[PDB]
C-alpha cells in the first residue's frame with residue numbers, strides 16, 4: 001500500500017529497486033523473490049572478513065558509506081580505528097521507518 | 112488531504128481512504144471518509160488563473 005526499497009546482491013551485480021512490492025514474511029534466496037508494481041527507480045552497477053556500512057536518509061537522498069578490512073579476532077569487533085569512505089547517493093524520495101536484512105539459504109521454506 | 116505535511120523532495124503515492132473521526136472506514140468511501148485525489152478540470156473557457 002506504500003512504496004519500499006530493495007537492495008540485493010547476486011553473484012556479479014547489484015540491483016536497487018523502489019517499486020511497490022508486497023513482501024513475504026521470510027524473504028531470502030536459495031543457493032529469487034521480488035515483485036514489480038509502479039516501479040519509480042532502478043539502478044544497476046558493478047570469518048576473516050569484516051564489511052561495515054552506514055545508512056542515512058536525508059532530504060530525499062539515501063546515503064551509504066562502506067569499508068572492508070581483514071580480521072583475525074575470535075568473535076567480537078576489533079579495537080582499532082578505520083574510517084568509512086562514501087559509496088553511493090540515491091534519489092529515492094520515500095519514507096523509511098523499518099528495515100530487514102536478507103540471507104542466502106539452502107532449503108526454501110516460504111513460511 | 113493528508114495526515115501530516117511533506118518533507119523536502121519526497122513523494123507519496125497511496126490509494127487510501129482518509130477518515131476524519133473515530134469511525135474506521137475499512138475500504139469504504141461513505142460518510143467522513145473520502146478519496147484523497149481530485150482532478151483539475153482544465154477548460155479553454157477558464158480565465159487566466
Ligand SMILES: *[C@@H]1O[C@H](CO)[C@@H](O[C@@H]2O[C@H](CO)[C@@H](O)[C@H](O)[C@H]2NC(C)=O)[C@H](O)[C@H]1NC(C)=O
Nearest residue numbers: 094095096097098113114115116117118121123
Ligand atoms: C512516515 O511513516 C511513518 C509510519 O507510517 C509515519 O508515522 C505515522 O504517523 C501518523 C501520524 O502522525 C501516526 O498516526 C502513526 O502512528 C505513525 N506511525 C508510526 C509507526 O509511528 C510518518 O508520519 C511518515 N512520515 C510522514 C512525513 O508522513
Ligand SMILES: *[C@@H]1O[C@H](CO)[C@@H](O)[C@H](O)[C@H]1NC(C)=O
Nearest residue numbers: 009010011012013014015034
Ligand atoms: C542478478 O540478477 C539480475 C536480475 O535481477 C540478472 O539479470 C543478473 O544476471 C544476475 N547476476 C548474476 C546471475 O550474476
Ligand SMILES: *[C@@H]1O[C@H](CO)[C@@H](O)[C@H](O)[C@H]1NC(C)=O
Nearest residue numbers: 001020037038039124125126
Ligand atoms: C500503478 O500503475 C497503474 C497503471 O496506470 C495504475 O492503474 C495504478 O493505480 C498504479 N498504482 C499506484 C499509483 O499506486
